[PDB]
Amino acid sequence: PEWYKSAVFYELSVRTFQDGNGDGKGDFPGLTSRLDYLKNLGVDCLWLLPWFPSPLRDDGYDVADYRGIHPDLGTLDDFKVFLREAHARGLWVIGDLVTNHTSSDHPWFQAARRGPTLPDGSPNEYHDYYVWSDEGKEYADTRIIFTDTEVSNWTLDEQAGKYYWHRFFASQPDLNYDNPKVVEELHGAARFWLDLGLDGFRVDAVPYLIEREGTSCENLPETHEILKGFRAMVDREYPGRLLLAEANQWPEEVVEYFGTEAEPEFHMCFNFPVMPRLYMSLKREDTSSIREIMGRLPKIPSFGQWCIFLRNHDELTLEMVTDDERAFMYAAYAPDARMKINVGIRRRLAPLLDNDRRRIELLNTVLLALPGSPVLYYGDEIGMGDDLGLPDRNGVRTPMQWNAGTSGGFSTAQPSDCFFPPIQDPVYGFGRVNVQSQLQDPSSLLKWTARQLELRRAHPAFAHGDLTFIETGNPAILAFTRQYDGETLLIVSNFAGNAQAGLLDLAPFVGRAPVTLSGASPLPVVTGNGQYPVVMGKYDYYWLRLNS
Amino acid sequence: PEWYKSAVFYELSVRTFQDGNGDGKGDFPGLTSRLDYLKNLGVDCLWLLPWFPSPLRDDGYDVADYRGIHPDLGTLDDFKVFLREAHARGLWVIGDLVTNHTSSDHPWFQAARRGPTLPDGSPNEYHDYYVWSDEGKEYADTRIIFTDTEVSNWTLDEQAGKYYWHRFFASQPDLNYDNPKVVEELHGAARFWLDLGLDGFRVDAVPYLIEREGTSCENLPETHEILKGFRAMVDREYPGRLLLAEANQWPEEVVEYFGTEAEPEFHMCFNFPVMPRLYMSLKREDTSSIREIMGRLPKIPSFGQWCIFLRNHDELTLEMVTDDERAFMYAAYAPDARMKINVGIRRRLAPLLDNDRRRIELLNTVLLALPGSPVLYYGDEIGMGDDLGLPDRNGVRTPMQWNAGTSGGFSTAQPSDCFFPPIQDPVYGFGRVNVQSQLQDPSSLLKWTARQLELRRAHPAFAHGDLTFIETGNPAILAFTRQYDGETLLIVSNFAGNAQAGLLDLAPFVGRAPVTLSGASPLPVVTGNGQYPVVMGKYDYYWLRLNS
Ligand SMILES: [Ca+2]
Ligand SMILES: [Ca+2]
Ligand SMILES: [Mg+2]
Ligand SMILES: [Mg+2]
């Protein structure tokens, strides 16, 4: 019933998607010119990365003005026409709300570092917007997220003569959520955009808002309380809008970000826990880690929906796996040391899978078949690669590859003048991987993706169904049912690189006939004790309905 | 065994493969520079299209000098070094021997058209090298092969004042094999090349040598007798050399080109009969035509070996199928009328299969898994397309696509200066489809092909085994065994575009365990009555061994 539950999401970065004025930077007019492509793909909601004024030290997640549009992306008018046109096509759009911190170039912080009092005796009302310390000795049981860059979560400010807190880069000072004026400022920022018609927000780094002595400073009850506040505001003032949480934590802690029926928080949260186990299972040819980790996720509220994903603008995060699992992933998916960043792996989806289309298809089917609303990362529809020559996580944020012309069609500016260089290598470069090609190619990955979303869209049980794992007698083979409104789907997936045999426990479905979702080819009726023998080719996916 | 039985063949055209001197024309030095690529691919024998002097009215199959090298391709020295280097790498090489006719520019024909007697009263000894008629009324129960171009197999020569015979173009007059001088001329031509160390010949258009009143003028006993003469000569003078027949006929008539143990003809013949049924079965999702047509092929001599192929330098021939089968193929594989030529379809393999890699892989596995020695058509290993803007069958003979540089790496001459233009379209063009890319791409089609030939090479039962079709209870699924030297291979192939179920009749193999040839994953042991249930994903191939 709520729109987000049946939507397909698409994550993109305006500066990196389409340049409309030849300066090497993506912009809103450019994005707007590509809306037909997104609609045709089968996308329903666009999630745009931060578009606000910013020195871009963390690519826009260091925000310097919550109520504007970064100059290189265009103007606020350009934004309003973009939104009009998106809505004209039946697309929703959500922004990225950066709550935990601002840029050090935010006027607030420039004001705040003047000290507790102005030179004229008056109180500096902005000073307590941020989190200050005399010695930087507090919150010591606290981990560092940007392990490769920051040595400490406290940094000394020259002119303020005190240490300030930051969970991310030193140029991203944390906001102080014990100060109620800060809560107002952000309720107000969100309002500004929701008043223009924005359909919601992806909310950034939600676990880290409140910090408390003698705790990890993650997932604190007071942090959750503030988030309940946001949801309460939106429910009252902007019914129907979406709030989606970036909360990368273990299952028990992630689910709490939905809140409860009585005290709601987020409508949606990313399913961070399943994501690594997908990759792990593929290398191990053993899907048990998927069932285990999915099994640890409690039921969610009635309004709740998972956002399922494979990759995104960040590294493949390994922060919320065991030390053994982390080491395995590095060994398997980060052979070069240059591939690691801050407890994670900074590679695009296709390279991670050795550009093996069968493996790419497989994981995409799992993405679309698990319970939640799926999100695609821009460029993965065509099999884009990465560029590890770029610092930080920018190697997975190269320009979208539209055609084989100048700079992949992203801009008329030459490749070395683009904000990030478009990829030109013989395997993943825009000469070989681009939209124009794949639109004309009857069997391209783009076309496959669209066809597969069409298929999903035609079976609501994917969006809304329950989930029940089936025993297969072979850990390489992952089987489950999705049931909803009388419909029973059976999804069988082979994570091995060669043919595999299984014995499915279909005892609950004796007497019923499985048929392929695609073309209704019938398989043998389920008989006897219901132990159903199968064979599967390498990386096969069987999308079935059980007819009664 | 004989070398040809375990060889993998590769068909290529020198003018079109690699240019070494920037004139837009492929040549021998160029070819020689690409021998490592062919060896590494897993090729054993190169079959070169005609390399002889010629006006190229049928792309070199109109021969004007049997004992030379066409100037565009280089010199006779260039040839000798090419051969030495091929042999240095353990590669065999065969040429194309054009027996049935010559160019009208051949000195023989220039001499012959002077008439039976010279202007000085002397007899013209060359006049009877060709086949002449006063009225062109003879051999009227005879079909026309180039239906789109030729209205008659007789053509009036201006200066000779008589009609001459030609099964092919009017510029390709048939040689007269009732004149024994002609037989000597060609025994001699073959000798010239075999003396240089050439390992054999593909022999062109063998059914059409002798023509007789009141017959079809195809497959005549006197034609076969002459071919026995060629074989006899090579067996005596050049033991170990290969003779491979182009004989496109129905099963009963093709097999006769092997001759018998007592009177041998050809070592190898192309398996023309199976080829169309492969394509048909895929569209119909019903493999019965393959079993039917394979079933009609009699056993062949001990020295005999089939040459299995999917495509070649000609059209996809529909001359030897039923009228109903022909109409179906046109409907399914020739939607544009421009795609038909002379009772066939002039398209490359990948375009025929909608560039669907799964379908490409499938047919390739079948090519490699049927009994015979397989032949690859140059460029199909990377998924090359075609150019229907070129006349006749030249649209499948575009330059090999080596890299994304100038003219696909085929030449430094620009694309409009190449002999045939290298393909530039967004789907199949050299920017997207080339060797360099696929060598660097871990999961490319090139790499797949090589990996799959490796796999074949490791199981001699593919080359030498018998063949037995297995009952599957589903026409979409084609199963068979190949047995040799105690080894039993089981090959199961799905020709449907969605998942299929089968029940394999493995009664003869109760108690034995099928394992994947690739990685030895075991499947359930064959039990009970031996009726073995399977499921297959779309276009899957299962390559299995049955272990005792
Ligand atoms: Ca904080
Ligand atoms: Ca003849
Ligand atoms: Mg711009
Ligand atoms: Mg040349």
Residue numbers in the entry:
A (entry chain A), B (entry chain B): 6 to 553
Quote the study that presented this structure, word for word.
Trehalose synthase (TS) catalyzes the reversible conversion of the inexpensive maltose into trehalose in the absence of any coenzyme. DrTS consists of a catalytic (β/α)8 barrel, subdomain B, a C-terminal β domain and two TS-unique subdomains (S7 and S8). Domain C and sub­domain S8 contribute to dimer formation, while subdomains B and S7 serve as a gateway for the opening and closing of the active site. In the present study, we have determined crystal structures of the wild type and the N253A mutant of TS from Deinococcus radiodurans (DrTS) that reveal a closed conformation for intramolecular isomerization.
The four or eight subunits in each asymmetric unit did not display significant differences, with root-mean-square deviations of 0.3–0.4 Å for all Cα atoms. The peak was assigned as a Tris from the crystallization solution, which contained 300 mM Tris–HCl, forming hydrogen bonds to Asp63, His106, Asp209, Glu251 and Arg398. In the wild-type structure, a similar Tris signal was also observed. Our present assay results indicated that the activity of DrTS is inhibited strongly by Tris, with a IC50 value of 4.88 mM in the presence of 50 mM maltose. Because of high structural homology, in particular similar active-site architectures and subdomain B orientations of TS to SH, AS and SI, we therefore conclude that the MsTS and MtTS structures may represent an open conformation of apo TS, while our DrTS–Tris complex represents a substrate-induced closed conformation for catalysis of the intramolecular isomerization. In particular, Arg148 forms salt bridges with Glu223 and Glu324, which form hydrogen bonds to Gln254 and Asn253, respectively. In addition, Asp153 forms two hydrogen bonds to Asn347. In DrTS, Ile150, Phe151 and Phe173 in subdomain B and His318, Asp319, Glu320 and Glu324 in S7 all constitute part of the active-site pocket. This means that interactions of the substrate with these residues would bring these two subdomains closer together to form a closed conformation.
